[PDB]
Amino acid sequence: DGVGSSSGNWHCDSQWLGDRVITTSTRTWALPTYNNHLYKQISNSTSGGSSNDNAYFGYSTPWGYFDFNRFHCHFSPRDWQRLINNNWGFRPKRLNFKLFNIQVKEVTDNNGVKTIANNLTSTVQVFTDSDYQLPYVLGSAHEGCLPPFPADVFMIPQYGYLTLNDGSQAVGRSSFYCLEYFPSQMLRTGNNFQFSYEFENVPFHSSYAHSQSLDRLMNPLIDQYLYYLSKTINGSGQNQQTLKFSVAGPSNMAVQGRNYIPGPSYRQQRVSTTVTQNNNSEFAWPGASSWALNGRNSLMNPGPAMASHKEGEDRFFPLSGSLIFGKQGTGRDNVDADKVMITNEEEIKTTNPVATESYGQVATNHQSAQAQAQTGWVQNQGILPGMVWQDRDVYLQGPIWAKIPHTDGNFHPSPLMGGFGMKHPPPQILIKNTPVPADPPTAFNKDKLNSFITQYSTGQVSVEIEWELQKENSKRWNPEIQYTSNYYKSNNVEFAVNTEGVYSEPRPIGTRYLTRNL
Amino acid sequence: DGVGSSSGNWHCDSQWLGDRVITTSTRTWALPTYNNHLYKQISNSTSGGSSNDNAYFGYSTPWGYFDFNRFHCHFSPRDWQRLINNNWGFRPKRLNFKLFNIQVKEVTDNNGVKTIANNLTSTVQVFTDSDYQLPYVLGSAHEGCLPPFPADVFMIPQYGYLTLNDGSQAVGRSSFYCLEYFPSQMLRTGNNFQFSYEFENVPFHSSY
Amino acid sequence: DGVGSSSGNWHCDSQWLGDRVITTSTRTWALPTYNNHLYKQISNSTSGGSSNDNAYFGYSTPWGYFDFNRFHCHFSPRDWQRLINNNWGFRPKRLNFKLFNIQVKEVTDNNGVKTIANNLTSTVQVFTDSDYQLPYVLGSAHEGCLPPFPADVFMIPQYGYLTLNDGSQAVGRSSFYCLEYFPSQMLRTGNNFQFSYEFENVPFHSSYAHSQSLDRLMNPLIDQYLYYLSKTINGSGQNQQTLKFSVAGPSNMAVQGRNYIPGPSYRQQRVSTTVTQNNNSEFAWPGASSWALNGRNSLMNPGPAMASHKEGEDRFFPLSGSLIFGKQGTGRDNVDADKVMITNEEEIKTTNPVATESYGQVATNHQSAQAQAQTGWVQNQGILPGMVWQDRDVYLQGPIWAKIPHTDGNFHPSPLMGGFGMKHPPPQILIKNTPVPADPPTAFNKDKLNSFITQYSTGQVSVEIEWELQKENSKRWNPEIQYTSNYYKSNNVEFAVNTEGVYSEPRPIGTRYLTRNL
Amino acid sequence: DGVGSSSGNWHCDSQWLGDRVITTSTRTWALPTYNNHLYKQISNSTSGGSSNDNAYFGYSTPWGYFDFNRFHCHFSPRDWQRLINNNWGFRPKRLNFKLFNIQV
Numbered sequence A, C: 001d002g003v004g005s006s007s008g009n010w011h012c013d014s015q016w017l018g019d020r021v022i023t024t025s026t027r028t029w030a031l032p033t034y035n036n037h038l039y040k041q042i043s044n045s046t047s048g049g050s051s052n053d054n055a056y057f058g059y060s061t062p063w064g065y066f067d068f069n070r071f072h073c074h075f076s077p078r079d080w081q082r083l084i085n086n087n088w089g090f091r092p093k094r095l096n097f098k099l100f101n102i103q104v105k106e107v108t109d110n111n112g113v114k115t116i117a118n119n120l121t122s123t124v125q126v127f128t129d130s131d132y133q134l135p136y137v138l139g140s141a142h143e144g145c146l147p148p149f150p151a152d153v154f155m156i157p158q159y160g161y162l163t164l165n166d167g168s169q170a171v172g173r174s175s176f177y178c179l180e181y182f183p184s185q186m187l188r189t190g191n192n193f194q195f196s197y198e199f200e201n202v203p204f205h206s207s208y209a210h211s212q213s214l215d216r217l218m219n220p221l222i223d224q225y226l227y228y229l230s231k232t233i234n235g236s237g238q239n240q241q242t243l244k245f246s247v248a249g250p251s252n253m254a255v256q257g258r259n260y261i262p263g264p265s266y267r268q269q270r271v272s273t274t275v276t277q278n279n280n281s282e283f284a285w286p287g288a289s290s291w292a293l294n295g296r297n298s299l300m301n302p303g304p305a306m307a308s309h310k311e312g313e314d315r316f317f318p319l320s321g322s323l324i325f326g327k328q329g330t331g332r333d334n335v336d337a338d339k340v341m342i343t344n345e346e347e348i349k350t351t352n353p354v355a356t357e358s359y360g361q362v363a364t365n366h367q368s369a370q371a372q373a374q375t376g377w378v379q380n381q382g383i384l385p386g387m388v389w390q391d392r393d394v395y396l397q398g399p400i401w402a403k404i405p406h407t408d409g410n411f412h413p414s415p416l417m418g419g420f421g422m423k424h425p426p427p428q429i430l431i432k433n434t435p436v437p438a439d440p441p442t443a444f445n446k447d448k449l450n451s452f453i454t455q456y457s458t459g460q461v462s463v464e465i466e467w468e469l470q471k472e473n474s475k476r477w478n479p480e481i482q483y484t485s486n487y488y489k490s491n492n493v494e495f496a497v498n499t500e501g502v503y504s505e506p507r508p509i510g511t512r513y514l515t516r517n518l
Numbered sequence B: 001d002g003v004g005s006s007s008g009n010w011h012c013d014s015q016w017l018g019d020r021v022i023t024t025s026t027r028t029w030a031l032p033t034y035n036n037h038l039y040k041q042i043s044n045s046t047s048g049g050s051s052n053d054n055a056y057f058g059y060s061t062p063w064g065y066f067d068f069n070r071f072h073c074h075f076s077p078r079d080w081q082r083l084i085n086n087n088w089g090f091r092p093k094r095l096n097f098k099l100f101n102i103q104v105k106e107v108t109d110n111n112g113v114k115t116i117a118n119n120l121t122s123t124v125q126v127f128t129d130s131d132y133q134l135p136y137v138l139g140s141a142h143e144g145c146l147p148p149f150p151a152d153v154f155m156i157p158q159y160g161y162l163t164l165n166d167g168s169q170a171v172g173r174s175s176f177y178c179l180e181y182f183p184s185q186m187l188r189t190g191n192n193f194q195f196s197y198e199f200e201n202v203p204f205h206s207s208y
Numbered sequence D: 001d002g003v004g005s006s007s008g009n010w011h012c013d014s015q016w017l018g019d020r021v022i023t024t025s026t027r028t029w030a031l032p033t034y035n036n037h038l039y040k041q042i043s044n045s046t047s048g049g050s051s052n053d054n055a056y057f058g059y060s061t062p063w064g065y066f067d068f069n070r071f072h073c074h075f076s077p078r079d080w081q082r083l084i085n086n087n088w089g090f091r092p093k094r095l096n097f098k099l100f101n102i103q104v
Helices: A077-086 B077-086 C077-086 D077-086
Strands: A014-016 A020-031 A057-065 A087-109 A114-118 A123-128 A158-163 A185-188 A193-198 A208-210 A227-231 A244-247 A270-272 A290-293 A296-299 A316-318 A324-326 A340-342 A360-363 A375-378 A401-403 A420-422 A429-433 A455-471 A514-516 B014-016 B021-023 B057-064 B094-099 B105-109 B114-118 B123-126 B158-163 B185-188 B193-198 C014-016 C020-031 C057-065 C087-109 C114-118 C123-128 C158-163 C185-188 C193-198 C208-210 C227-231 C244-247 C270-272 C290-293 C296-299 C316-318 C324-326 C340-342 C360-363 C375-378 C401-403 C420-422 C429-433 C455-471 C514-516 D014-016 D021-023
Touching (some): A020 A077, A077 A087, A087 A185, A087 A514, B021 B077, B077 D077, C020 C077, C020 C429, C077 C455, C087 C123, C087 C185
Parallel strands (some): A208 A514
Antiparallel strands (some): A020 A455, A057 A429, A087 A455, A123 A185, A270 A316, A290 A296, B014 B021, B057 B158, B094 B193, B123 B185, C014 C020, C020 C455, C057 C429, C290 C296, C360 C375, D014 D021
16 A cells, blocks of 8 residues: 555464464564675685585575575474474475565765665565476575574575586586566565465374384284294304204394384494594594585485484484584584584484494305305495385474475485475575666766665565374373473573573474384 | 555566467666756767768757667577577567656765755656657667666666758758657656557568 | 279360360379489589589489479460460469379399289379478479370479588588478379369469550650750860750650660670671680579579560570570480570560660769760669569460579569469479388398389379460450461471371460550 | 278378377388297207306297387487477377288
8 A cells, every 4th residue: 555554464473273283473574785786606716615525606696585494483482392292293284475564775874974764765576486497595404594583683695596517617507597587576665475375295294203113013922933043053063063943032032023124324423422532533524424426525414314322322423414503602613512502313213223333234155164154234225125214303493394306206205304395395485675776877878887775675574384283192101201491490591582682592302202103 | 556555566577378479578777867958959060070971960858768679688598599499480469568666866966975865756757659750769779778687777878869961060951859749648656657569560580 | 992993084175264274184104213212312422523513412312293384284285376366364273183093013024024013002102292391393494294295104203302512511401301201192003192272363474565665655746845955065166065955755756754664684695596606715604694602603594584686686695594495306415506496585575675785874974074974884783663574475385383482582573484483382292102122031130121122103193274364355456466387388297296206396485476555 | 991992191290289299100111921930939059158147048939019119210300309409308198000001
């Protein structure tokens, strides 16, 4: 309508229906003017770089975009607690999104002084990519999420997209997407933007951690009917040889036959949190587990979902397996371990192998009267038939979805970092304030106008997700293990604002506190 | 309507139907104030010139005009490639044109400093020549086309028109067109201007 | 149906309705097997050649085609006479075409002896090009027309098509058309093939030769009202100068003003039929009029329609202007003039300039008291506004139509050789007997079969054209000039078969014997 | 019907509809007589062979068969070019097959 009347009402709540959670999250935002309204190429040769591994070629755009894919945007910790206590699984269904109360402002620097005066004529243009024709940048869990605590006011991240490269030089396939093609609603003060979305069917993310390990599914009372080869040697001395078979039973359980086998494993170097126990050598880059592509050596950061510490040893975690988050106010580089929250997967320990430990032991050479049996270790094991694995736990800070790259084939496309892999995620939402030129010269000139009015805009965003649920049916007798707040007097409340206003999150929150049978 | 609501949505795309190409191209623009709102005569005797061959007499006007007649305005090279690979000939049919989101601004120089403050009262007037009563300046492929790459912001070319001459002096047939006669929609912030067109039948340009 | 019953009745007649001529012409034919069922490239480097001018690159195909575009196919001379006596103009309308009574035969050479035995299983495949996707070879008036005299049995010409070239080497645009793509009715003995056609509207070809010259349209009795400059010099001696204007009138007629001007001219060298009058030098190639393209020097064979001999001089004709035909039994190379029928255009002498003579005289330098007037000759003159020309006469032997090459633009596309230029001629009709392999080897082999049964086919063709007419309305009082047969006792009848059976045509036949006003 | 009339018309073309390609390919063929109308066994011991890796046992039949599964059968290169320039993906749907004009 007009400048006077408001475009939309601030609405932020999480309401709990019988089996669904409608979480609105509405936070105010500010969009600067990037690159002076230019497109540029970002190839490392612009700024330094020594390596082939980090060689990258890509374009930077003025457009900003909204990255909300983290959870902490949509769930107040108390409500999160309410989710992961009472529910085995949850899935999104719909996504509603609203921009409103856009207001544009204009900075004027005269001499050593700035003056911010509202601009009613200016516009701000927004569009969503429905058909995924653009690159998808939201998958890597970049910084710039909606702030956890709505009282904050955040900057919108700039948007740029990498393409093919050789060294710092671009191959003829290198795409250039001018973000301008797509029809983009021009918004002025007093216009709101909204759209709806339907998440495609995704398997419910399991929040239940298994209540009985895979290696023991058996019945401790009753024998099987099978015979493992128990004793080859009939006794000490020469030419003592026999085949003695014996029932696999509760006496020796590890040898029984089992219908299934644990999930795949890809080795990770073991790093102890204690200082003195690790080796006194630089092993971070050289010893790490890295998958190589096209001559690029890329870390195998967060790979197959696999447990980290063997029971009773919490001192060490894998070098590059576990997802690591920073505490509030964590420095940028060379941060000590104390200031950093290292995640830990104990919940998956039952059905998946240890990251730091081998997947098993396989024989190599045919035994013979002359030649002894020899068994080599298995460092990596792909999928086998009848193998069972479980996907990585999905943390409150960690991302929600990621786009499954459109390709001939893929296997079990659950993103390694976590969450719900999809063929058609919720679209990107891109916003740029339209450039307004400073006064041109009167005499005509060929060149484009490089002189613009320093400008930025401000508004709200409303991201309303409807989470489907699955409710706990279990008959478990004994009281559950659950999630609590440490009760001993603490100087500050966890998950609550500090004295000077800095909001902070004390520790990561795993998804799986419930137990369930295999 | 009013200052708050937007006049029109940015729409730039090229969509390919069975046998047609609808190419929208939408780029932002800036129009200065030419000649301090005056008409003048441009005859070479104003500025130098040594020759009879270059002798020219004509008027300069404040009015700006949109010269889009180049192709690179309407076709993204990748889409152009798609055109001239798969097709022997192509012809225009319709032309739709829209101005929107006009906003006027006002420069104030006090001492050694400029201040640009929005002006809500001011107007901007636009008209199209339907009957071709004016000279036609778009034919010579002058500079000032819409920029190839929409992220650019361009200046509108000034409009002036030559007439008969002898040396630097004008013959009695020399026409003077005051561009003001024609009815011209007065636009203020929050008004949009649009019209439609039908290209007359033209032989398909051979791309083969 | 079947082998026994006949496919179609021989029908050859020309019947005259009120204003139309339906001429059926049905002649039997024989199609050999070309290139052993292969495609090949014909580039001059295959066989010799010394020149850039004759450099040609093109493909030869097995397919044969029917070239009927000459007139003598469709008109018995007596009927032709009936046409060009009584009619000012004529145009085709419809074309009906029929193949029938196809019979395939098989040659077997045993030892020094051949045996021709009918083959009932074999096929012969025919198709027409409706969409003109192939090259159009019928335009150049190639030999291989249906014979004039239906008792003859003729061979079908082979089909091959030139493309772009540089020297003997092909440029990347060089097209290769496998004639096989197009759907082609497979015919076996006892199948007939037929289709219909509609000629697009073409201007009536004028058979009338004008009864009053262009230079004199005036009224010999009455003056005009104009003044040409009659006398510049007031008399002998110095400083005698005046401007004396006088009416242009019957006294001096050549100076009157005229609304129109004769058609364009492109000079042709004059060659006298008498031996001794021509120069004693080789001038055939060097002195000829040739338009050059892409460095090729191409003769300007049959160019703009322009008269040949100035009245009262029949001794010489242009070097490469006039269409020249050979008498029956004319040798291939270095034939003397007597054995060759040289065409002559006297009918167009009124409205078009002489080929051997300049188009006019134009001044060059500004006259002055000091400098005399000077006038250079005009060798070539393009079209000017208000210019009138008339197209070349269309001989009984000469072609009917030619395809106007599909292009951005063309001007008055009446083919220089003659007849009716069209955007969509009557389509080409291509016929090839399908290859039948000789027995293969039993053991499998990769290569294609190169061993085929020598084979050929035979049948009839029926080309039924409907010619529209325009009838003579003239009020001329005196008896017309007309076409006759020389009555003095001749050893053989003209246009009739010789003693040993050789059919012959004594002299060309022009189209225009009628007179009409401008 | 009978010997005289033809069984079917040679039809070879590739026509491009809005989103489909109907490619007819029609080529003449010749079928010899294999194995003098016998079945035989082809085991390597028939003809030489030194190896366990190449050991093979199988039957040879008189029957011939049509192997068209290659692409170059169904696409004229110019038409192939037209396919892989303008299109991300393509899939077959129907297959029609015709023998005609058999002559022994």
